């Protein structure tokens, strides 16, 4: 869940302005252009902040996006609407720079998406712009810039 469902017990202190963006609720990218192509797809599971792949059913229902990677990588999920079950996808043709889930890494390392849509060190897909940031016991994020697929 992008937004922590459990309510907080205390009001936050809005005095500092540093290191206030390394959160899982942060949706989108650090740098966003007005000419970016954005699509919306039915969500299979929770692909938020993970690479997505197109999955076709038996034909009765339309195609959807599921967390994955490898040669089946189609795009990167940057946002999700839970009420409508909709996943926001930036196509792999379009380049993306933002915080993505990392497999539980130093700047300059070449990262590729695994079968679960998690970035892992090495075809390369992105370059790590920072180090792993731990949000939960198994949840790690990393700032990466995706520039398509190149061997």
């Amino acid at each position: 869940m992008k937004n922590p469902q459990q309510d907080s017990g205390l009001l936050s202190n809005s005095i500092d302005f540093r290191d206030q963006n390394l959160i899982f609720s942060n949706s989108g990218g650090v740098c966003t252009s007005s000419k970016d192509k954005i699509e919306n797809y039915p969500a299979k599971g929770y692909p938020y902040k993970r690479g997505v792949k197109l999955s076709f059913g038996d034909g009765t229902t339309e195609l959807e996006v599921e967390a994955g990677g490898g040669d089946d990588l189609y795009g990167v999920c940057s946002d999700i609407d839970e009420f409508s079950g909709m996943a926001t996808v930036i196509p792999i043709t379009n380049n993306f720079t933002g915080y993505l889930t990392l497999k539980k890494v130093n700047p300059g390392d070449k990262l590729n998406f695994n079968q679960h849509g998690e970035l892992e060190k090495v075809s390369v897909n992105a370059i790590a712009l920072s180090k792993a940031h731990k949000l939960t016991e198994d949840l790690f994020i990393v700032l990466a810039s995706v520039f398509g697929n190149r061997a």
Binding site: P42, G59, T60, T61, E62, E64, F83, S84, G85
Partner: protein
């Protein structure tokens, strides 16, 4: 005629007619599709039903 380009008014009228046909089909059958076979239906939210389904 060659490029199938229309004025805004006529294009809006035709598009609205098609959308109303789709809405009537949804209200009747409970599914949204543009194929005669009925495949590739749009995944819809729960608690959204028609008279037939």
């Amino acid at each position: 005629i060659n490029n199938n380009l229309l004025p805004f008014a006529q294009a809006y009228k035709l598009a609205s007619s098609e959308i109303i046909k789709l809405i009537n089909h949804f209200v009747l059958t409970g599914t949204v599709s543009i194929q005669k076979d009925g495949k590739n239906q749009k995944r819809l939210l729960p608690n959204m039903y028609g008279l037939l389904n």
